[PDB]
């Protein structure tokens, strides 16, 4: 139908939208701590701490398949990698305070994306 391409395009910008949110939330993580998944190899435990890991690759290939329906769906992953390092570091390491400082820059970027995604709905 008409209807399901008008859908489909509306998808493919949110799509277009969140994908410059990703760039720009991923550029302030200069030390790349959440560009890939916690390697099981090195960290053999890590899924008895935390149930649902999430990085930024994985994010990557679920908004390129159109994975994402709406802005709350992407802002969920990306706490999610904020909150599984806040548990897994303690307060004293690199990886907490990376942390700390992409979820403060980040809500800059994320206040104005939810406008943006209102705005053009």
Not at 82 to 105: G, P
């Amino acid at each position: 139908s008409m209807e399901q391409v008008a859908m489909e395009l509306r998808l493919t910008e949110l799509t277009r939208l969140l994908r410059s949110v990703l760039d720009q939330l991923q550029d302030k993580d200069p030390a790349r701590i959440f560009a890939q998944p916690v390697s099981l190899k090195e960290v053999p435990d890590y899924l008895d701490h935390i149930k649902h890991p999430m990085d930024f690759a994985t994010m990557r290939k679920r908004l390129e398949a159109q994975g994402y329906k709406n802005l709350h769906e992407f802002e969920e992953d990306f706490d999610l990698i904020i909150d599984n390092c806040m548990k897994y570091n303690a307060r004293d390491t690199v990886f907490y305070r990376a942390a700390v400082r992409l979820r403060d820059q980040g809500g800059v970027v994320l206040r104005q994306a939810r406008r943006e995604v209102d705005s053009i709905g």
